[PDB]
Amino acid sequence: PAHGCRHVAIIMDGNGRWAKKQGKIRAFGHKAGAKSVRRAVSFAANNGIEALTLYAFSALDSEVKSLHRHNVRLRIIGDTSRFNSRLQERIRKSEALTAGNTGLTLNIAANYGGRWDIVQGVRQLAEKVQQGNLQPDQIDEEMLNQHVCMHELAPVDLVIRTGGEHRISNFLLWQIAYAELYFTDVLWPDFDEQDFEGALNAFANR
Amino acid sequence: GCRHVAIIMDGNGRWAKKQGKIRAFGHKAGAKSVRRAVSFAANNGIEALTLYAFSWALDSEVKSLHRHNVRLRIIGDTSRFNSRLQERIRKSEALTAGNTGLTLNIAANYGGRWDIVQGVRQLAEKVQQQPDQIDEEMLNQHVCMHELAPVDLVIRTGGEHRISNFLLWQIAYAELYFTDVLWPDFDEQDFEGALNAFAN
Numbered sequence A: 001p002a003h004g005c006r007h008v009a010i011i012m013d014g015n016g017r018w019a020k021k022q023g024k025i026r027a028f029g030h031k032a033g034a035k036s037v038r039r040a041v042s043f044a045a046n047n048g049i050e051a052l053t054l055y056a057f058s059a060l061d062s063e064v065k066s067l068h069r070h071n072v073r074l075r076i077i078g079d080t081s082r083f084n085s086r087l088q089e090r091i092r093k094s095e096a097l098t099a100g101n102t103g104l105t106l107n108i109a110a111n112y113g114g115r116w117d118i119v120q121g122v123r124q125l126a127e128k129v130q131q132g133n134l135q136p137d138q139i140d141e142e143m144l145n146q147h148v149c150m151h152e153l154a155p156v157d158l159v160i161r162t163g164g165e166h167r168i169s170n171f172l173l174w175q176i177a178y179a180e181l182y183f184t185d186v187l188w189p190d191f192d193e194q195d196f197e198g199a200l201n202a203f204a205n206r
Numbered sequence B: 001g002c003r004h005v006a007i008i009m010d011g012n013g014r015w016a017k018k019q020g021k022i023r024a025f026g027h028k029a030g031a032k033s034v035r036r037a038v039s040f041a042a043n044n045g046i047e048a049l050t051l052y053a054f055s056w057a058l059d060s061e062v063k064s065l066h067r068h069n070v071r072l073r074i075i076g077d078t079s080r081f082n083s084r085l086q087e088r089i090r091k092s093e094a095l096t097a098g099n100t101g102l103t104l105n106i107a108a109n110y111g112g113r114w115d116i117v118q119g120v121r122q123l124a125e126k127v128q129q130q131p132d133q134i135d136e137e138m139l140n141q142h143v144c145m146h147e148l149a150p151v152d153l154v155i156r157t158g159g160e161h162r163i164s165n166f167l168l169w170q171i172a173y174a175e176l177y178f179t180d181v182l183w184p185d186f187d188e189q190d191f192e193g194a195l196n197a198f199a200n
């Protein structure tokens, strides 16, 4: 924690382009990006990062065993409701397995949108209104902040986007109010331990 | 086609410091840079320019803006502002409300989070009298600037790479452009550079 960064969020763009530059099809890029994911997760866990939130931008897993091993707590954020029910149980089971883990919290955005995220936290507040439990004039920023995804973690300190586009693309919105935004042209499958080091270094400075 | 630009105008104080001057002199060179940006936007067919002053002028500039066919709006929490200022804002907005050129939104005591929370306070008062009908489009209709073109481009001068609680909901799909140029120095050429970035 020289870098002092508790919660990094990453928009992992560039898989497709990475594959095309090599004359390979899209699928090769995705497999390469998966390897980049494991590399990043390791890095975060070995550098005292408290939370890493990953957004795969334009799937599945046997990593859970390995994550659970490294005391990583796994959370899926997004609208899982529509997922075919086998999928939902698998997610639930992976979350329940690692729920008591105390190392890195790894949030993996799936069918996630920043606006959806805010909207659903609004529903909850609007729920506790109808129950007559809370007044409409009582709603403040801290309030609505306790009902959006990852309210329980440290605030997002750093958002990295690879692949060259300079936009949020409906990823976290409420939660990035004060975050450092770091954009790199590096494509996601080449984004390595030094690039991640590069990013944290730049967060340090203000 | 860039329709709505939003600017986080940072670096006035640092500019003053850099010039061997006190803070107030940075604030006057900042005001000039506002006038330059406003003319530029109007001159290049931008529909909406939203300006966030980041680390009172109505009677000085309102007549010129009206002349120039600019519609003025203030966004932010002005509830705790003097009653006279509130009347002037109202008057100024009313005076320019039919102008057909640039819409200039000035963000005064504004916060992105505050803007959503105050949109949330609205729906929650109507819930007190359907919490499966509050969806994205419904909340969008209660956030600032919903009736205008969506923000295409957010410019932040002064070398910081953050949004600093400016538009949040509104910038979901905007291009974000960060420049080390300090606001008082941000000119037409710099504005073009940013429009170029948006074009690619």
Ligand SMILES: CCCCCCCCCCCCCCOc1cccc(O)c1C(=O)O
Binding pocket: B009, B027, B028, B030, B031, B032, B034, B035, B038, B039, B042, B051, B053, B057, B061, B064, B065, B068, B070, B106
């Ligand atoms: C085509 C028409 C040309 C005429 C254009 C007229 C626009 C005139 C506005 C100039 C003054 C800037 C006040 C708004 O921003 C601020 C708000 C609060 C505190 C500040 O320090 C500032 C700041 O200095 O950046």
